[PDB]
Amino acid sequence: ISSQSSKIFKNCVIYINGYTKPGRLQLHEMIVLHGGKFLHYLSSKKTVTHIVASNLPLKKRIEFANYKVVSPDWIVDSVKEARLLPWQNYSLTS
Numbered sequence: 001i002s003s004q005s006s007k008i009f010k011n012c013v014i015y016i017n018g019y020t021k022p023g024r025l026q027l028h029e030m031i032v033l034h035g036g037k038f039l040h041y042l043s044s045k046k047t048v049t050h051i052v053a054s055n056l057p058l059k060k061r062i063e064f065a066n067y068k069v070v071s072p073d074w075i076v077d078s079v080k081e082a083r084l085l086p087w088q089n090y091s092l093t094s
Contacts, residue, residue: 008078008085009036016052020072027052027072030079042067056092069093 004010009031015038016024028038039048051069061069074090088094 006082007035008083009034012050013037013039013048014050014052015039015042015048018053020052020054027075030075034079050087053092061093064093067093
């Protein structure tokens, strides 16, 4: 009835900020195909759980302490492994 397989981003809404390789469109597609959800843009309010940056500045790590900011490699590599990865390894929020 329901595959529910490679559900790496199933409970995860992901926003992308800055210039990330590969493109924000591509990373967001990698999220969706893995049963995941995404966000276009935030305006201070907590309507996301994960953010993707190329690099994330220190005062913005404080700005986004509430949101698990990571490198695009979390999304790219998890999809290539078809498994959940430690986002704390790829963390740009800390």
